[PDB]
Design an enzyme around this catalytic site. Structure first.
Site, PDB file in Angstrom:
ATOM      1  N   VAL A  52     -29.375  98.155  -4.697  1.00  0.00           N
ATOM      2  CA  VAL A  52     -30.651  97.492  -4.886  1.00  0.00           C
ATOM      3  C   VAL A  52     -30.856  96.478  -3.778  1.00  0.00           C
ATOM      4  O   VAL A  52     -29.926  95.757  -3.397  1.00  0.00           O
ATOM      5  CB  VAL A  52     -30.734  96.841  -6.277  1.00  0.00           C
ATOM      6  CG1 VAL A  52     -32.149  96.337  -6.541  1.00  0.00           C
ATOM      7  CG2 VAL A  52     -30.315  97.845  -7.323  1.00  0.00           C
ATOM      8  N   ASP A 155     -28.761 102.137 -21.987  1.00  0.00           N
ATOM      9  CA  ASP A 155     -27.895 101.285 -21.176  1.00  0.00           C
ATOM     10  C   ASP A 155     -28.325  99.833 -21.359  1.00  0.00           C
ATOM     11  O   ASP A 155     -28.483  99.073 -20.407  1.00  0.00           O
ATOM     12  CB  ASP A 155     -27.928 101.726 -19.709  1.00  0.00           C
ATOM     13  CG  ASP A 155     -26.818 101.088 -18.858  1.00  0.00           C
ATOM     14  OD1 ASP A 155     -25.746 100.734 -19.396  1.00  0.00           O
ATOM     15  OD2 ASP A 155     -27.007 100.951 -17.620  1.00  0.00           O
TER      16      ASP A 155
END
Ligand SMILES: O=C(O)Cc1c[nH]c2cc(Cl)ccc12
Ligand SMILES: O=C(O)Cc1c[nH]c2cc(Cl)ccc12
Length: 331
Positions: A52, A155
């Site tokens: 990211v 998640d």
């Protein structure tokens, strides 16, 4: 004789009543933007499934978040893209602004809205008892929306709750493991992070549903109000159930196994032992009493259940007395 089937008890048939294109992400056709719209600025972290970066859209000079996707089946990429596109504009859902592909390295990347890089794991000792309730509520908003949309996140954990404290802004991120819920589908159980894996995952019961996200929420709630991170700290997936059993007791564990006729790994046969169900008071102590109340304790107990069907749904949780003053204040 085979496991006993199970149906989600809310939003069961939502996807059946959608056009096929809504959930048939395998046939979704991605329209790629140009990756030269964006210049990478700095690395924000993460690994394993992606990398990211903070990035600038040169066109409007506004800050953006770029997740370079790590090589995985094209359909898992289409899956995440379609879930994002389907959930666009939902309360506290991260918003996808674009999808691009490296000119040369053909590597696909997702471009997201910006929010100030602070997730829920940090920001920890700064949270008051009212802050926990307010951010828990905000997470329930996002969970109930995606569930109503036929999608389970799978998640849910503190690293995936981004918060801007200065503006009381919260965004549920990382949809890379999210699936559409279909009555009677048998799902892969190697999802979630160990400390947040529901029991259904740990005993290989595959016909699970949205309630898995509610277990994971319960784990977060517990570690916060008790200030023990993680709350169920198992050394592996097997020992992770033993840790759960030392707290929820083995009586209910084995009733669950029976009710759904689950065949247990001969492994566990030797490690689960006999364990009473503990009263939550045993995890209370002077440094965290200020975060524990009858309301929080009642709410927590109603999330952490072996049987996925007796866990509160998102909408039931949102109506729990635990949230009364945040419900009041927010109106
Ligand atoms: O530095 C790189 O990896 C190349 C690159 C420059 N700008 C980008 C924007 C995105 Cl979204 C993905 C990759 C790139
Ligand atoms: O969406 C994802 O799964 C990737 C991601 C990791 N950290 C972030 C922080 C922001 Cl603000 C937006 C998106 C991400």
């Amino acid at each position: 004789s085979g496991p006993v089937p199970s149906r989600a008890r809310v939003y069961t048939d939502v996807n059946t009543h959608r056009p096929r294109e809504y959930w048939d992400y395998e046939s979704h056709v991605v329209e790629w933007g140009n990756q030269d719209d964006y210049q990478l600025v700095r690395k924000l972290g993460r690994g394993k499934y992606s990398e990211v970066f903070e990035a600038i859209n040169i066109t409007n000079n506004e800050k953006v978040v770029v997740k370079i996707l790590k090589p995985v089946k094209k359909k898992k990429i289409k899956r995440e893209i379609k879930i994002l596109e389907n959930l666009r504009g939902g309360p506290n859902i991260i918003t996808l602004a674009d999808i691009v592909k490296d000119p040369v390295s053909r590597t696909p990347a997702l471009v997201f809205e910006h929010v100030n890089n602070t997730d829920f794991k940090q920001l920890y000792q700064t949270l008051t008892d009212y802050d926990i309730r307010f951010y828990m509520y905000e997470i329930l908003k996002a969970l109930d929306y995606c569930h109503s949309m036929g999608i389970m996140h799978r998640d849910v954990k503190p690293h995936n709750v981004m918060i801007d404290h200065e503006h009381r802004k919260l965004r549920l991120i990382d949809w890379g493991l999210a699936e559409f819920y279909h009555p009677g589908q048998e799902y892969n159980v190697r999802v979630a992070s160990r400390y947040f894996k529901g029991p259904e995952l740990l005993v290989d019961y595959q016909m699970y549903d949205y309630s898995l996200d509610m277990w994971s929420l319960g784990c977060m709630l517990a570690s916060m109000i008790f200030r023990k991170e993680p709350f169920f700290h198992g050394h592996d997936n097997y020992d992770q159930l033993v840790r759960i059993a030392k707290v929820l007791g083995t009586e209910d564990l084995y009733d669950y196994i029976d009710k759904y006729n689950i065949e247990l790994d001969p492994r566990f046969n030797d490690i689960l032992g006999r364990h009473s169900r503990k009263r939550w008071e045993r995890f209370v102590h002077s440094e965290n009493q200020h975060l524990v109340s009858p309301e929080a304790l009642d709410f927590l107990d109603k999330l952490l259940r072996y049987d996925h069907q007796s866990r509160l749904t998102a909408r039931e949780a949102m109506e729990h007395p635990y949230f009364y003053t945040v419900v009041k204040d927010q109106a």
